[PDB]
């Protein structure tokens, strides 16, 4: 498959400018595509906001062309997007994709954030189980990931061995204006006391890479 | 510039049913019409173009039709994993995605399981305490959570986040944090979230004794 | 008086892009198909309107080979009634398609470090393809209102684009060989089996 990776920072002051770039791998630059750019946020839907040819000619969304600058690089195999005196209505997951007519590939996206408040990493807290109880129960466990700002963390448990049954949440703003969010996963009540849960957290906008362990709490 | 609308904007249905969602544009497009899925948390995923040819890898019960103005798409038996919100877009001049359309999963009613969790000693050294409180794998979304501090009703200092439906029961899950200083937490004894749900004959509370 | 020639389409060096898929006429020979159903190389062997073992016991007008490199994921479109973009612009079958639809994981041959490579599709058409026509043509399709007249642009898209065959690809993203053989009884039976 045609791969788009993302990159570029995605917390972006008002008016400052946002510029982001996608690596192409499995396809060439050098194609009869437009690579292009296309932003999600709540209520908008799918926003279109350009493409650009490898020649370098550029098709904008007419809204944002003042605003908006894309360039190709082919020796690289890459295109940028650049967006320039952001304001919070910027704010949205935004998404590189080949297009020909279609968008058939599409990157990851990349969360961007307009704000002035300040990178914070999170702290994490266990969510201890307290049900060592009857075999063939259930015991739920989990770890907090409190006060951090921007968008995106990441939670794994046992680096990725443990998928079923785990929740992680929606990040929800605090009164204090900092993200916070809990994973938790429910386990069998018997292998509490032998088996290890740990929680990968990571929050790459602060470099913040923790794993936290959550064992029983007793008396 | 041609635009494009849906409908229904969303729509719940069980399990092995037909789903049909509309595009209508605003003037005459040809066939140049693509529908994309997009699951949360992820890129949207072609699924059609050209009206109705399926793009390479694409699951049979995925099918469009459609020509000029009036387009369709079909998922002529829906799968837990097809929770999604599904777009149309044309090429046939600038660039336009319609509005999407939200499907959701109807199933049967569950009664959530509800767990709570003391602050940790971590963050009590760090001078706040959290209380989580678990709504485990219930439907249909609706629940209402309301703490109580020492049989006091709180209100100010709870944040509630929900899950989206589960991809393989077709379930929610919900957390409800109460968070306090360390020296409010220190002033209290009963924590309590109180949790009212339809599969509930009444409501039900689970409670965390500081210092027990 | 002689063995039709099989190894020079399942074993050929190269193979054609599914756009410009290849055909090869089996004439005036006897068919061993032996060697085909007694393989293990395959990976998809399936067959409409015949046994695949009693073809050595049959006899046909007209035998016809077609070769060509697509996906894993897409060998499932070598087949009537599919309505996927290989189907529809590529390679069409018919619905009262007698042959068999052979096909092999080819990714230490066709797959390269690189992603860019030489094996194309066609992405757009103005109509679907009839059953077993071919379309090698390179105009500028047409999306939008105005005629394109021979100039690429904003909804006026070159219609061949390449697979991104990569060694490191999944099996569904990998470049399969695929060869259809085709037997019709429309005339005098010149292919017939060695029974
Ligand atoms: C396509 O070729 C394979 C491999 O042929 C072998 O390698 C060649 C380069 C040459 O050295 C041949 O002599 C070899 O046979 C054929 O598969 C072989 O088929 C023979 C049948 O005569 C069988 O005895 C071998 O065991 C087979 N070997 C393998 C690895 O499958 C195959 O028959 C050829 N395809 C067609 C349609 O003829
Ligand atoms: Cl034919």
């Known amino acids: 498959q045609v791969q788009l990776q993302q990159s570029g920072p995605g917390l972006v002051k008002p008016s400052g400018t946002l510029s982001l770039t996608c690596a192409v791998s499995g396809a060439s630059i050098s194609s009869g595509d437009w690579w292009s750019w296309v932003r999600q946020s709540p209520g908008r839907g799918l926003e279109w906001i350009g493409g650009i040819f490898h020649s370098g000619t550029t098709n904008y969304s007419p809204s944002l062309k003042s605003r908006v600058t894309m360039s190709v690089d082919q020796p690289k195999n890459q295109f940028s997007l650049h967006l320039t ?75 990725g061995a443990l998928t079923s049954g785990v929740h992680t949440f929606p990040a929800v703003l605090q009164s204090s204006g900092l993200y916070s969010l809990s994973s938790v996963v429910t386990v069998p009540s018997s292998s509490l006391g032998t088996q290890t849960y740990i929680c990968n957290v990571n929050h790459k906008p602060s470099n913040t890479k923790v794993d936290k362990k959550v064992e029983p709490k007793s008396c | ?95 336009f995605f319609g509005g999407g359309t939200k499907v959701e999963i109807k199933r049967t009613v569950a009664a959530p399981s509800v767990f709570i969790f003391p602050p940790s000693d971590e963050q009590l050294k760090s001078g706040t305490a959290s209380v989580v409180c678990l709504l485990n794998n219930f439907y249909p ?72 | 008086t002689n063995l039709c020639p099989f190894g020079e389409v399942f074993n050929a060096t190269r193979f054609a892009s599914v756009y410009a898929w290849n055909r090869k006429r089996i004439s005036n020979c006897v068919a061993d198909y032996s060697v085909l159903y007694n393989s293990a190389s395959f990976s998809t062997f399936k067959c409409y309107g015949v046994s695949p073992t009693k073809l050595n016991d049959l006899c046909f007008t007209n035998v016809y080979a077609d070769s060509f490199v697509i996906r894993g994921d897409e060998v499932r479109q070598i087949a009537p009634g599919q309505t996927g973009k290989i189907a529809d612009y590529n390679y069409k079958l018919p619905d009262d398609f007698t042959g068999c639809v052979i096909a092999w994981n080819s990714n230490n041959l066709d797959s390269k470090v690189g992603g860019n490579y030489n094996y194309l599709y ?49 099996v569904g993203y990998q470049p399969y060989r695929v060869v259809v053989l085709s037997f019709e009884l429309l005339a005098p039976a010149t292919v017939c089996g060695p029974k």
């Not at chain 1, 969360?111 to 969510?127: D, H, I, N, R």
């Not at chain 2, 069980?14 to 789903?19: I, K, L």
Request: proline content about 5%; charged content about 15%; overall charge neutral.
């Open chain 1, 85 to 159: 005196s952001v304001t919070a209505a910027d704010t949205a997951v935004y998404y590189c994709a080949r297009m020909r007519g279609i968008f058939d590939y599409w990157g990851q996206g990349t969360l961007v954030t307009v704000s002035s408040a300040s990178t914070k990493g999170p702290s994490v807290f266990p969510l201890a189980p307290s049900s060592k109880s009857t075999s063939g129960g259930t015991a739920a466990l989990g770890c907090l990931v409190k006060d951090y700002f921007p968008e995106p963390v990441t939670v794994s448990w046992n680096s």
């Open chain 3, 122 to 170: 066609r992405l757009f058409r103005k109509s679907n393809l009839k059953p077993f026509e071919r379309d090698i043509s390179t105009e500028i399709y047409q999306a939008g209102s105005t005629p394109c007249n021979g100039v690429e642009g904003f909804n006026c898209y070159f219609p061949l684009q390449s697979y991104g065959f990569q060694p490191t690809n999944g």
């Open chain 2, 1 to 95: 510039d041609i635009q494009l609308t849906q409908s229904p904007s969303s729509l719940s249905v069980s399990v092995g049913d037909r789903v049909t969602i509309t595009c209508r544009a605003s003037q005459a497009i040809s066939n140049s019409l693509a529908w994309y899925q997009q699951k949360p948390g992820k890129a949207p995923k072609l699924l059609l173009y050209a009206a109705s040819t399926l793009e390479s890898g694409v699951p049979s019960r995925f099918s469009g039709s459609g020509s000029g103005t009036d387009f369709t798409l079909t998922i002529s038996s829906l799968q837990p994993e097809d929770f999604a919100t599904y777009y149309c877009q044309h090429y046939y001049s600038t660039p």
């Open chain 2, 141 to 212: 979304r609706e629940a209402k959570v309301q703490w109580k501090v020492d049989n006091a009703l709180q209100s100010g200092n709870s944040q509630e986040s929900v899950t989206e439906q589960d991809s393989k029961d077709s379930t929610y899950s919900l957390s409800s944090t109460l968070t306090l200083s360390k020296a409010d937490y220190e002033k209290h004894k009963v924590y309590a979230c109180e949790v009212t749900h339809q599969g509930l004959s009444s409501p039900v509370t689970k409670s965390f004794n500081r210092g027990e």
